[PDB]
Design a binder for these strands. Structure first.
Ligand SMILES: [Zn+2]
Ligand SMILES: [Zn+2]
Ligand SMILES: [Zn+2]
Ligand SMILES: [Zn+2]
Length: 1237
RNA sequence: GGACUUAAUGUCACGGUACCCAAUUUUCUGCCCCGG
RNA sequence: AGUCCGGGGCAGAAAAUUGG
C-alpha cells in the first residue's frame, strides 16, 4: 500500500548500454556485457534521441547483496529479529530459472534456523526476496508483488526536449593488460556517462508487506554499487569554418605554398596553449625587420589582408565559442582541409555457453571474528607528465557505430584531465600482483569465480574516479622515428602526444572492506608513498616506458569504520561516498562519532613483503651530465609564436607548483625524455650491431628484451632530462645566426639563411643536466655491464645531446653520479704531427686580385653505394682529432646576434657594432664556420660538385642552366652522392664528422693597434655584395668554378687608411667590429664515426695543408683578414670490443700509411707531392701565405675612390671589350696571381 | 498514477590501465665586387 | 651624351606529419 520513491545520487561516471530487448539480448553479446549497467531507449525509428533508465531487477539484486552482507556482519541479530538463510534454488519441476544466476559467494550463518518459515510468518529476508508472494516470473499482469522495484527514470534535468544521447553519453574504450607482456590483449567499447548534469535517477518502490521496512531502509542506505559507480541513496559553425578553411587552403595554393598548408595548422592548434591576445592583441611574430616581407608564414597577404589580421577578423566574428573551442575547431578544420586531398581484437565474453552448473556456494564466516573496513585517501601527485589514451580522435561518436590528430589525452565534458577509475584499479592490481609474487591473468567469461591470490582481495576493495583540479589545454610533445640506417627522418615517422603538466594533484580513495588489513596493501601503499628516499613509484597511466605516468601518492591519511558494533553510524553516513574532497582537509579534531584513524600502521622499513618483491622491482640511479657547448632542442613549431622572430628555439617543459595554483611564469628548460631514450637505444644497437635488421616483432635479440619490441613492454624506462643550473648565468640563452654561403659567388644563397637560437654553455662553465634511468631486477651481469658501457659512451662524448651535432651543439663531456644508492652501477664505472710539405707558389714571388675561380672541368665521380650509418665497423676508423688553431693575421669573427655590441651606435646612429663571438663570456669560435670552410676545402680538393649553388639566377638568365648537368648539388640518395658530402654529410644523411667549438684560453686577448684613433675597437672598409655578372659575362663561356680568396697582409692598408674609410666616406653605411691579435693558441676537436681509411688521410691533410699554407676564416677575406693554420695534436681511435677498453692514438711518425692511400686514390678521379695534380696545385697555390715578402692585393675602383686610387687598371679599360676582352677575363680570374699590372 | 521500459526464491562486470615499439629532426662559414 | 651612382639584397627554401 504505502509507496517509497528514492533517488540515485551518483558521484562517479557510471555506465549505460543500449537495452535492445531480452529476446534480442542474446543476439548482441554486449547486452549481457552490460546487464549490470544502466539502459538506453530509442523513441523514433531513425535511432534518434530517447531516454535512459536502470532495470528494477538490478536495484533488486543490489538490495539483496546489501541485506546479505549486512545480516552476515550482524551475525543474524537484526535488532532481535532473526532471519533465515533464504532460498536461492530453482527448477523444482521444469525449470523456470530467473534471467540472472548468482555465481557468487553467498554469505550465510552456521544454523540461522529459529523456526520453519511459511507464507504465514515469513522472515523479513523472505519478504525482501518475496519467495512467498502472490506473483510469478512469467508476467506481472497486476501489482500482485509483495515488493516491486519499478523503473528508475531521470531526475528533473530530463526536460521534454528529448535530450540527445551525445549530451548524456560519450563513447569510451576499456582495456586489459597482461603481466609478462605489456601489449593490449583485448579492448572493448563502453559508454561512460557523466555525473554532472544527468547524474540522478528517480525510481518508485512498493512494499505491500509491513515487517520489512527496517531492513529495506538499511539496505538502501548500505548499497554502494550501482551501474559501476558509487551511489548515494535517499528516500523522498561547422559550415562557415569549413568554407573559411577551404578558402584559406585555396589562397595558400595559389600562393605556391601548397606544402605549407599544414605547418600553420600545427601552430594554430598550438595557439590553445597561449591566450586570446596571441593573435588579438597585436599579431603573431612580425618576422624580418627590414625585408619588407613580414613573417615567412604569418604576415602573408591572404585574400588581401594579412594572415595576422584575417584570423583576427575571424576571431572577432567568432567570439561566441571562446578561445580553446575555436582554436581547436579551426585546427581540426584545417587538418580536414589538407587531408581531403593529402587489426586488433575485441573480447566481451558474456554468455552461458561455457557450462550450466551454477552450483550454490555457501560461505559462512568463522564464529567470533571481527570484520572491519579501511578507507585510504590522499593526493595522487604526478612527478612526471602523464598521458592517458582514448579511442581514435573524433571517432567516439556515442550512440552510433560503423579533431583528427595525435594520441589525444582523456578529458571529460569539463575539458580537463582525468584519471579513469579503471586505470587506477589496474595499476593497483598490477602492484598487488607484484607484491604477492604470483597470481592469475585476468580471463573474462569465467562462469566460476577466479580464486587467485590477488583476485580474493579485489572483491573487498573499491576506489573511485579521479578528476583534476585544473583545466588548461595540454602541450603537444613531438616524436620522430629516426632511421638508424641514415640517422635522419623518413616518411611516415612523425606523430604527436598530448601529455599533461607535471606536478598536478588528484584525489585518490582506496576503501577496503575485509576481515583484516592485508600486509600487501600496507606495503604497496608505502611503495606508492613519496618517502624521503622512495619518492613514490606509482607507474600509473600510459607511455610508462617512455617516462610518462610516474605518479607519487602523497599525504596519506588512514581511517577505519566498524561493521560489527557501529554499523548504523555507517548506514547514516554511507561512508562519505562522494564526500572525500572534504575528507582530504577534514582535520583530526573534526572526526565524526567513531572512525578512529588506524593506529596500527607501521613505517616504511617495517613490512617484510615490501623489501622482498616491491622495491627490488625498480632500481633508479640518477646521474648528472655537464655540457660545455650550446644546446638546441628544435622546437620550431612553438617558435611560430612569442616575440623574437626565430626559426629554431629550444624545447621547454611545463610544471605545476606543489601547494600553489597555476603554472610558474618561467618555463623549465629541459631535454625530452624521448630523445633520452632514443640516444640510449641507438647506442646499445650500435654497440650490439643489431640495428638495421628486418624487424623486432618476433625477435629475441639483445635489443628486444632491454628496450622492448612490438609485443613486450620495455624493461627500461627513463625520465625527462632537466637543466638544474639555471639561475647562475644571467645570459642562459644565446643567439647564433647561420648562413649557407654560395660556392659560386662567396655570398649567401638566394633563400638559405637558417638562423638558430640555442642555449649557452662554456667548457669552463657547463650546463648541469640532471636525470634518472630505471632498471628492473632481471638484468644479468652482461646486460648491466652493457648499460654501464652505454653510460661510458656518453662519458666520452660519442653521442651529442640535442640537435645539430655536426656543428658542436650539445657535446657531453662527462657524467657524474649522485649519492642515491647507485652502488649497483657505480662499481662498474709524443710530439704533435706536422706535415713537411712545402709549396713553391712561384706565380709572383718577387696587380693581383683577391678572389680567384677554380675551374675543374666536368669530370664528376659519385659513390652510388652509400656507406650506411649503422653500428660501428671495426676496420673503419673512428675517433677524435685535437688540433691547435693558430692565428697569423688578425682574426675577425663577429657575434652577429648583437648588432650594437660595441656600443658605438650612440656616436654614429645606424652603424653596425659587431662583437667578437663569445659564449658565457668566454672566447669561442662557431663550429659551423670551420664546418663550412673545411667542407669547401675538401670538396674543392675532391672537385666533386657544388655543395651550394645559386640556381635560378640571371647574369649579364638561367644561371643554373649554364652549368653542365654534372656539377649539380647533392640530389637524392639513389642516383649518387658527392664524395665531399659522403663524409661531411648532405641532406637526408647524417655527416659522420662532428665539428667542435674552439676554446682559445691563451695568447693575447686583443689587438691593441697602438696609435689607432678608435677606442678599444677598430673600423673596417664597407663591403658590397658580389656581382657575378662580370665574372661570367660572355654567353659563349660556360661557367667559372669554385671561389677562393688569396692570403696576404692586406689588413695593413685598412689599419692605415682607417680615418679615410670610416669618416671621410660612409658615415653610417659601414660595418665595424673587433679583431684578434697574432699568436693566439687554441684547441678544438674534430670527432667522427665509421670513416673509411682512404678518406681519413684526405681529411687530416685538408685540415692541415702543411707548411707555408693557411686557411682563410672570418670576414674581410678579400682584404686578407683571417689567415689561420690548424695543426693536429693527436689523432685518437677507440675499439668497440671491450678487450681494448683504453683508447689509442696512431703513431706520431707523420701519421704513416694514412694519407698515402688517399693520395693514390686521387689519381683515379715517400712524402706526398700535391703539385703533380692539375687541380690540387692550383688549390694550394691560392692558399699560399707569402708573409711567413709582402704582396699588396686590393680591389680596383671604377673611376675615382673617395680617398685612394693612386696612379690605371680600372673597370672601363678592363671592362671594355677592346682593351681587355671578356674572353681573357675568365682566364685572368682562374690563373693564380695573374699579371694585370 | 496508467503509457513508452524490467521481471522477482539467484548478475564478482570494483570481472578488464587504449595498455604497447618507434631520437623535431640531418644537411647550411654571417659571408661580401662593380653597372642604370 | 650626361651626371650621379651601391654599402644592404638574403633573412630559411628543401625532406617526413602515418605505419605495425
Ligand atoms: Zn525464512
Ligand atoms: Zn588472480
Ligand atoms: Zn631483436
Ligand atoms: Zn655535394
Amino acid at each position: 500500500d504505502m509507496n517509497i520513491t528514492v533517488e540515485l545520487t551518483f558521484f562517479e561516471p557510471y555506465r549505460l548500454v543500449e537495452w535492445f530487448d531480452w529476446d534480442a539480448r542474446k543476439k548482441s553479446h554486449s547486452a549481457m556485457r552490460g546487464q549490470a549497467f544502466a539502459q538506453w531507449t530509442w523513441k523514433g525509428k531513425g535511432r534518434t534521441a530517447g531516454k535512459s533508465f536502470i532495470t528494477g531487477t538490478l536495484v533488486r539484486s543490489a538490495v539483496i547483496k546489501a541485506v546479505e552482507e549486512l545480516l552476515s556482519l550482524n551475525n543474524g541479530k537484526w535488532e532481535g529479529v532473526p532471519c533465515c538463510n533464504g532460498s536461492f534454488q530453482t527448477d523444482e519441476s521444469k525449470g523456470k530459472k530467473p534471467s540472472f544466476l548468482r555465481k557468487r559467494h553467498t554469505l550465510q550463518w552456521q544454523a540461522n534456523n529459529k523456526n520453519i518459515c511459511d507464507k504465514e510468518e515469513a522472515c523479513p529476508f523472505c519478504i525482501l526476496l518475496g519467495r512467498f508472494d502472490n506473483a510469478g516470473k512469467v508476467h506481472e499482469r497486476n501489482k500482485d508483488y509483495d515488493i516491486h522495484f519499478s523503473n528508475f527514470d531521470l531526475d528533473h534535468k530530463q526536460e521534454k526536449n528529448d535530450l540527445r544521447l551525445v549530451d548524456i553519453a560519450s563513447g569510451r574504450i576499456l582495456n586489459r593488460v597482461d603481466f609478462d607482456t605489456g601489449k593490449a590483449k583485448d579492448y572493448f567499447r563502453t559508454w561512460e556517462a557523466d555525473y554532472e548534469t544527468y547524474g540522478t535517477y528517480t525510481g518508485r518502490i512498493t512494499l505491500r508487506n509491513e515487517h520489512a521496512k527496517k531492513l529495506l531502509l538499511a539496505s538502501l542506505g548500505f548499497v554502494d554499487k550501482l551501474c559501476g559507480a558509487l551511489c548515494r541513496i535517499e528516500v523522498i559553425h561547422n559550415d562557415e569554418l569549413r568554407k573559411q578553411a577551404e578558402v584559406i587552403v585555396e589562397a595558400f595554393k595559389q600562393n605556391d605554398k601548397l606544402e605549407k598548408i599544414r605547418i600553420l595548422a600545427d601552430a594554430i592548434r598550438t595557439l590553445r596553449l597561449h591566450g586570446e591576445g596571441v593573435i588579438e592583441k597585436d599579431e603573431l611574430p612580425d618576422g624580418k625587420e627590414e625585408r619588407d616581407k613580414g613573417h615567412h608564414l604569418w604576415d602573408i597577404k591572404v585574400q588581401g589582408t594579412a594572415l595576422r589580421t584575417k584570423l583576427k577578423e575571424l576571431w572577432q566574428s567568432n567570439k561566441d565559442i571562446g578561445w580553446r573551442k575555436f582554436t581547436e575547431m579551426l585546427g581540426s578544420n584545417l587538418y580536414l582541409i589538407y587531408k581531403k586531398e593529402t587489426g586488433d581484437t575485441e573480447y566481451y565474453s558474456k554468455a552461458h555457453d561455457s557450462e550450466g552448473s551454477d552450483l550454490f556456494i555457501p560461505v559462512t564466516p568463522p564464529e567470533g571474528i571481527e570484520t572491519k573496513e579501511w578507507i585510504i585517501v590522499g593526493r595522487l601527485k604526478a612527478a612526471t607528465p602523464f598521458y592517458f589514451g582514448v579511442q581514435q580522435p573524433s571517432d567516439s561518436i556515442p550512440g552510433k557505430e560503423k579533431e583528427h590528430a595525435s594520441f589525444n589525452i582523456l578529458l571529460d565534458k569539463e575539458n580537463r584531465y582525468r584519471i579513469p577509475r579503471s586505470a587506477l584499479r589496474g595499476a593497483l592490481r598490477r602492484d598487488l600482483r607484484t607484491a604477492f609474487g604470483s597470481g592469475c591473468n585476468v580471463s573474462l567469461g569465467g562462469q566460476i569465480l577466479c580464486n587467485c591470490k590477488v583476485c580474493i582481495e579485489m572483491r573487498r576493495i573499491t576506489l573511485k574516479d579521479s578528476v583534476s583540479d585544473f583545466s588548461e589545454p595540454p602541450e603537444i610533445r613531438y616524436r620522430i622515428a629516426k632511421n638508424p640506417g641514415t640517422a635522419t627522418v623518413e616518411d611516415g615517422s612523425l606523430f604527436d602526444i598530448e601529455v599533461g603538466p607535471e606536478g598536478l594533484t588528484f584525489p585518490f580513495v582506496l576503501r577496503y572492506r575485509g576481515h583484516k588489513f592485508p600486509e600487501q596493501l600496507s606495503s604497496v601503499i608505502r611503495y606508492w608513498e613519496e618517502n624521503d628516499g622512495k619518492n613514490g613509484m606509482a607507474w600509473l597511466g600510459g607511455l610508462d616506458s617512455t617516462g610518462k605516468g610516474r605518479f607519487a601518492l602523497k599525504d596519506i591519511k588512514i581511517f577505519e569504520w566498524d561493521l560489527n558494533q557501529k554499523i548504523n553510524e555507517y548506514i547514516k553516513e554511507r561512508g562519505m561516498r562522494g564526500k572525500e574532497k572534504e575528507l582530504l582537509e577534514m582535520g583530526e579534531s573534526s572526526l565524526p562519532d567513531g572512525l578512529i584513524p588506524y593506529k596500527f600502521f607501521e613505517e616504511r622499513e617495517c613490512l617484510f613483503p615490501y623489501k622482498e618483491n616491491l622495491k627490488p622491482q625498480w632500481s633508479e640511479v640518477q646521474y648528472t651530465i655537464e655540457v660545455g657547448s650550446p644546446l638546441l632542442t628544435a622546437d620550431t613549431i612553438s617558435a611560430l609564436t612569442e616575440p623574437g622572430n626565430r626559426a629554431a628555439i629550444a624545447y621547454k617543459k611545463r610544471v605545476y607548483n606543489d601547494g600553489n595554483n597555476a603554472i610558474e611564469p618561467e618555463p623549465r628548460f629541459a631535454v625530452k625524455s624521448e630523445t633520452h631514450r632514443g640516444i640510449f637505444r641507438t647506442a646499445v644497437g650500435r654497440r650490439t650491431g643489431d640495428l638495421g635488421k628486418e624487424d623486432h616483432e618476433d625477435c629475441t635479440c639483445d635489443m628486444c628484451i632491454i628496450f622492448g619490441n612490438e609485443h613486450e613492454s620495455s624493461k627500461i624506462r627513463f625520465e625527462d632530462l632537466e637543466l638544474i643550473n639555471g639561475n647562475e648565468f644571467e645570459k642562459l640563452e644565446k643567439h647564433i645566426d647561420h648562413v649557407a654561403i654560395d660556392r659560386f659567388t662567396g655570398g649567401a644563397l638566394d633563400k638559405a639563411k637558417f638562423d638558430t637560437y640555442p642555449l649557452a654553455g662554456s667548457p669552463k662553465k657547463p650546463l648541469k643536466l640532471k636525470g634518472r634511468f630505471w632498471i628492473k631486477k632481471g638484468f644479468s651481469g652482461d646486460h648491466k655491464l652493457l648499460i654501464t658501457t652505454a653510460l661510458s659512451d656518453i662519458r666520452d662524448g660519442l653521442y651529442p645531446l640535442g640537435s645539430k651535432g655536426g656543428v658542436g651543439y650539445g657535446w657531453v663531456a662527462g657524467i657524474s653520479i649522485d649519492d642515491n644508492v647507485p652502488d649497483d652501477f657505480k662499481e662498474m664505472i709524443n710530439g704533435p704531427i706536422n706535415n713537411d710539405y712545402v709549396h713553391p707558389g712561384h706565380q709572383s714571388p718577387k696587380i693581383y686580385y683577391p678572389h680567384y675561380f677554380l675551374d675543374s672541368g666536368s669530370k664528376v665521380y659519385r659513390e652510388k653505394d652509400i656507406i650506411t650509418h649503422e653500428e660501428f665497423t671495426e676496420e673503419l676508423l673512428s675517433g677524435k682529432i685535437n688540433c691547435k688553431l693558430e692565428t697569423l693575421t688578425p682574426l675577425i669573427i663577429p657575434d652577429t646576434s648583437d648588432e650594437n655590441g660595441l656600443k658605438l651606435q650612440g656616436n654614429k646612429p645606424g652603424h653596425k657594432n659587431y662583437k667578437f663571438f663569445n659564449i658565457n663570456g668566454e672566447l669561442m669560435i662557431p663550429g659551423s664556420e670551420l664546418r663550412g670552410m673545411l667542407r669547401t676545402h675538401f670538396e674543392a680538393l675532391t672537385k666533386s660538385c657544388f655543395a651550394i649553388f645559386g640556381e635560378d639566377s640571371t647574369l649579364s638568365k638561367t644561371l643554373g642552366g649554364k652549368l653542365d648537368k654534372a656539377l649539380h648539388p647533392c640530389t637524392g640518395l639513389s642516383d649518387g652522392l658527392c664524395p665531399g658530402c659522403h663524409l661531411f654529410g648532405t641532406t637526408d644523411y647524417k655527416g659522420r664528422v662532428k665539428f667542435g667549438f674552439a676554446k682559445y684560453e691563451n695568447g693575447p686577448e686583443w689587438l691593441i693597434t697602438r696609435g689607432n684613433n678608435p677606442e678599444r675597437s677598430l673600423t673596417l672598409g664597407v663591403l658590397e655584395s658580389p656581382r657575378p655578372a662580370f665574372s661570367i659575362p660572355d654567353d659563349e663561356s660556360e661557367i667559372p668554378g669554385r671561389k677562393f680568396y688569396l692570403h696576404h697582409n692586406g689588413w695593413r692598408i685598412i689599419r692605415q687608411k682607417q680615418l679615410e674609410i670610416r669618416e671621410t666616406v660612409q658615415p653610417e653605411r659601414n660595418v665595424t667590429t673587433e679583431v684578434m691579435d697574432k699568436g693566439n693558441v687554441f684547441s678544438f676537436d674534430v670527432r667522427f664515426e665509421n670513416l673509411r681509411e682512404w678518406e681519413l688521410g684526405l681529411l687530416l691533410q685538408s685540415l692541415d695543408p702543411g707548411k707555408n699554407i693557411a686557411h682563410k676564416l672570418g670576414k674581410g677575406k678579400p682584404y686578407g683578414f683571417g689567415s689561420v693554420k690548424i695543426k693536429i695534436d693527436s689523432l685518437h681511435t677507440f675499439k668497440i670490443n671491450s678487450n681494448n677498453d683504453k683508447i689509442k692514438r696512431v703513431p706520431q711518425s707523420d701519421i704513416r700509411e694514412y694519407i698515402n692511400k688517399g693520395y693514390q686514390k686521387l689519381i683515379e678521379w715517400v712524402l706526398p707531392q700535391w703539385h703533380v695534380i692539375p687541380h690540387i696545385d692550383k688549390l694550394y697555390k691560392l692558399l699560399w701565405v707569402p708573409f711567413l715578402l709582402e704582396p699588396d692585393v686590393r680591389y680596383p675602383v671604377l673611376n675615382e675612390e673617395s680617398k685612394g686610387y693612386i696612379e690605371d687598371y680600372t673597370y672601363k679599360k678592363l671592362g671594355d671589350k677592346d682593351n681587355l676582352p671578356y674572353k681573357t677575363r675568365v682566364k685572368g680570374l682562374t690563373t693564380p696571381w695573374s699579371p694585370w699590372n
